[PDB]
Design a protein around this nucleic acid. Sequence first.
DNA 1: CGGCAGTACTG
DNA 2: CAGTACT
DNA 3: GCCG
Length: 320
Amino acid sequence: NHNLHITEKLEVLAKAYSVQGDKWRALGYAKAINALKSFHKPVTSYQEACSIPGIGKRMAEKIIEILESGHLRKLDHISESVPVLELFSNIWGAGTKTAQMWYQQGFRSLEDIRSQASLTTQQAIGLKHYSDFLERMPREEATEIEQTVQKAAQAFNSGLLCVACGSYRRGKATCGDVDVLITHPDGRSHRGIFSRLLDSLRQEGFLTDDLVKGETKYLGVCRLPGPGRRHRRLDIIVVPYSEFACALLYFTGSAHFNRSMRALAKTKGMSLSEHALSTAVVRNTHGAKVGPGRVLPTPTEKDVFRLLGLPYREPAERDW
DNA sequence: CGGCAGTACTG
DNA sequence: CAGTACT
DNA sequence: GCCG
Ligand SMILES: [Mg+2]
Ligand code: NA
Ligand code: NA
Ligand code: NA
Ligand code: NA
């Protein structure tokens, strides 16, 4: 990154807007920051600033203040609440609205939350694992977790296919969590497996707590056996084989990659989700779907790219 | 002016 | 529903 | 915040 001296300070403002609930402005900042992180050359002129897609006048104005002054004055006026709101919204299950409410109620520390806050079931689990859930794990450990799930799944039905997606499949050296996709080529045998699979994973103590237990998605907490192990977040999704490619594409991400691909699909009169790529999507002036299109056949990830007019990108080059 | 991705889950 | 979360 |  040729512009750390710029993006480092912009990340601070971005985070501030984010934890305070100003999501669209934070989005703008996030996008400008990626753009600036990707520019070969350091940004040396306002005129060059506006050159970058994702940098407007307001953003160029700021980047010149830093290159001239070495600082950004707006940093000095960020509300004193922001570190506390960040502290609180790093509890899994608590977002900006809950953090703001706890702040308004006078809470300032996790000890305050522990002793005085009303916590949802999910938030109590998040609090219990506060430090662990902020740690990334070695990808070698994500491998062990994926293998644990696969062996438990295969025990019931040999034919079940299990794949660790997310940052793991994008090849990263560390992973925030483990994202396992499960399906079955027969197109039928995936149904109703969660009961048995999850019960199997609790049997000898691997699954330690459940956060979400839906018909298609599980989000929870696991810990491998032995000493020196931390609790890790584990997501599992079970999908029909006909949706495998789009589920794989969604679950591999990155998030910003997914949002860019879906935005592209919308421009082309199409819609892309975890379930399918659809064409002839009828929308309103609000950008929202009011009429459903036709599902297009997408046997492989490459097919999704092709139908969108894009060259195929391996998971490693989706790390946006 | 107004979208900024599209979806699942919780209570 | 609003909130939070997933990529 | 940015952009069509
Ligand atoms: Mg992940
Ligand atoms: Na620009
Ligand atoms: Na949170
Ligand atoms: Na009190
Ligand atoms: Na995940």
